From Swiss-Prot, chain A:
Keyword entries, A-Z: Complement alternate pathway, Complement pathway, Cytolysis, Disulfide bond, Immunity, Innate immunity, Membrane, Membrane attack complex, Pyrrolidone carboxylic acid, Retinol-binding, Secreted, Signal, Target cell membrane, Target membrane
One Gene Ontology biological process: complement activation, classical pathway
Residues that span the membrane, as ranges: none
Protein name as it appears in the record: Complement component C8 gamma chain
Organism the protein comes from: Homo sapiens (Human)
From Swiss-Prot, chain B:
Record lineage: Eukaryota, Metazoa, Chordata, Craniata, Vertebrata
Keywords for this protein: Cleavage on pair of basic residues, Complement alternate pathway, Complement pathway, Cytolysis, Disease variant, Disulfide bond, EGF-like domain, Glycoprotein, Immunity, Innate immunity, Membrane, Membrane attack complex, Repeat, Secreted, Signal, Target cell membrane, Target membrane, Transmembrane, Transmembrane beta strand
MF terms in GO: complement binding; protein-containing complex binding
Main subcellular location of this protein, as a coarse class: secreted
Organism in which the protein naturally occurs: Homo sapiens (Human)
Quaternary state and interactors: Heterotrimer of 3 chains: alpha (C8A), beta (C8B) and gamma (C8G); the alpha and gamma chains are disulfide bonded. Component of the membrane attack complex (MAC), composed of complement C5b, C6, C7, C8A, C8B, C8G and multiple copies of the pore-forming subunit C9.
GO terms of biological process kind: complement activation; complement activation, alternative pathway; complement activation, classical pathway; immune response; killing of cells of another organism; positive regulation of immune response
Protein name: Complement component C8 alpha chain
Full protein segment contained here: 139 to 492 of 584
Length: 159, 328
């Protein structure tokens, strides 16, 4: 249903993205968010490191995003559902809207820098409303306290 | 039963005596395998599988928290939070200046307090070998032709305390002790010290040391248009340490590879855990196989004051007398 950006360029999408907000009917998110950063490299044509804290300690998660459209990716785990990631809208240079669909969906807003513009923000809220999510269900992530690195004992490597 | 749990990691090593003159381990002093009718365990919630739910941005815990059985001679044992403590890089123009910083670190290596009256000796960063291999390997390369680099780090996995009273000695040591003459004899008593140590551990830390020395052909290095730091950084990277010839170096698995970066030898001084081993692979292997990297220790004869054999006192005074001569 959600289309990826037409002609999605993995090369320009590379680098560091800051998690701004997530739209979601996730039970977890509605019941302390952490500053979250994504580090993206194409591997073939995407390797994805998330850095964020858990109980005051920085972790690096390594994942892989590879099915044959462009902004559509397969994430695999343990007995989890597979996740489809769609890079729906981005300008490569300031913002990005990613959709993650397990079974029955979250919409994430990332930026290259903060603050995000009014127009990027409105557009995201519009998508969230169109994913049948309410403004209640938009959770904004912190703007400080990012993890610049995780040591070798605090890498969760799913690759 | 209770036997289903692995023992506390390193318990066998903490049970060993230590010889401060030879700086190597002796046979067991404490019985490491004695449980004495009691099932004491230690929760380890420092080594679980973290999960990440990317959809909900949830980074959470696996219920794969383990119990370890604590033997009777360990009063306490606490697993530490694993952390990178910083990796040091040093560079030396010659073998002696490396050897020098090494042996100087064997004086950094030991502290002392005195009980209120038993000495308490304090080893920090203690390796449990004479380094005879390492010294003889390096002495091949004491020539102006060679330069050296060294990366070093240290990680602690646990802190422990031994029991202070009603200690159960190793069956070996007990039999030896039974066999010692009541009539002082230096030979027989020195033999016992050679078998069980000059000292035994009363507390300490489990962990490891990750350390490599590079020996480098300076002339060759120059020719290659690289530096000793270039080489070390390339070597570091091969170990998973985060910061043409290098690509050709790879992991330096062959002499061909090593010589691409003017590297004549890679000398390991890794202790605990487990060619070369990657930093992360070493860190993993420290969960199940540490050494006693730091410890407090007391003179061997002191333990006879605290065993379940009870009053053991003319052997004690003979052992002390003998240890006095032995240590000089
Ligand atoms: Cl910050």
């Amino acid at each position: 249903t959600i289309q990826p950006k037409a002609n999605f360029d993995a090369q320009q999408f590379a680098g560091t993205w800051l998690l701004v907000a997530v739209g979601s009917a996730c039970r977890f998110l509605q019941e302390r968010a952490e500053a979250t950063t994504l580090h993206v490299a194409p591997q073939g044509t995407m390797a994805v490191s998330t850095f964020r804290k858990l109980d005051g300690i920085c972790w690096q998660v390594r994942q892989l995003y590879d099915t044959g459209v462009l902004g559509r990716f397969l994430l695999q785990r343990d007995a989890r559902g597979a996740v489809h990631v769609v890079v729906a809208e981005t300008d490569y240079q300031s913002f990005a809207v990613l959709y993650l669909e397990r079974a029955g969906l979250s919409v994430k807003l990332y930026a290259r820098s903060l603050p995000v513009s009014d127009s990027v923000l409105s557009g995201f809220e519009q998508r969230v409303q169109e994913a049948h999510l309410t403004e209640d269900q938009i959770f904004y992530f912190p703007k400080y306290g990012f993890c610049e690195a995780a040591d070798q004992f605090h890498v969760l490597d799913e690759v | 039963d209770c036997s289903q749990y692995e023992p506390i990691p390193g318990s066998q090593k903490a049970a060993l005596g230590y010889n401060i003159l030879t700086q190597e381990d002796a046979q067991s002093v404490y019985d490491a395998s004695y449980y004495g009718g009691q099932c004491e365990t230690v929760y380890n919630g420092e080594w679980r599988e973290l999960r990440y739910d990317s959809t909900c941005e949830r980074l959470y815990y696996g219920d794969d928290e383990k119990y370890f059985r604590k033997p009777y001679n360990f009063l306490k044992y606490h697993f530490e939070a694993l952390a990178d403590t910083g990796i040091s890089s040093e560079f030396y123009d010659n073998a002696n200046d490396l050897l020098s910083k090494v042996k100087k670190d064997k004086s950094d290596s030991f502290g002392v307090t005195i009980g209120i009256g038993s000495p308490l000796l304090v080893g920090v960063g203690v390796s449990h070998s004479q380094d005879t291999s390492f010294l003889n390997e390096l002495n091949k390369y004491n020539e102006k032709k060679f330069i050296f680099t060294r990366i070093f780090t240290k990680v602690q996995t646990a802190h422990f305390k031994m029991r202070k009273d009603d200690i159960m000695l190793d069956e070996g040591m007990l039999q030896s002790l039974m066999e010692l003459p009541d009539q002082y004899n230096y030979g027989m008593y020195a033999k016992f010290i050679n078998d069980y140590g000059t000292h035994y551990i009363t507390s300490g830390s489990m962990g490891g040391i990750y350390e490599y020395i590079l020996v480098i052909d300076k002339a060759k290095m120059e020719s290659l248009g690289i530096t000793s730091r270039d080489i070390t950084t390339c070597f570091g990277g091969s170990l998973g340490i985060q910061y043409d010839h290098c690509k050709k170096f790879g992991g330096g698995k062959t002499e061909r590879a090593r010589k691409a970066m003017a590297v004549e030898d890679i000398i390991s001084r890794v202790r605990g855990g487990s060619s070369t081993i990657t930093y992360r692979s070493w860190g993993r292997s420290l969960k199940y196989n540490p050494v006693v990297i730091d410890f407090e220790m007391q003179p061997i004869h002191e333990v006879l004051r605290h065993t379940s054999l009870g009053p053991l006192e003319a052997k004690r005074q003979n052992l002390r007398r003998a240890l006095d001569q032995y240590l000089m």
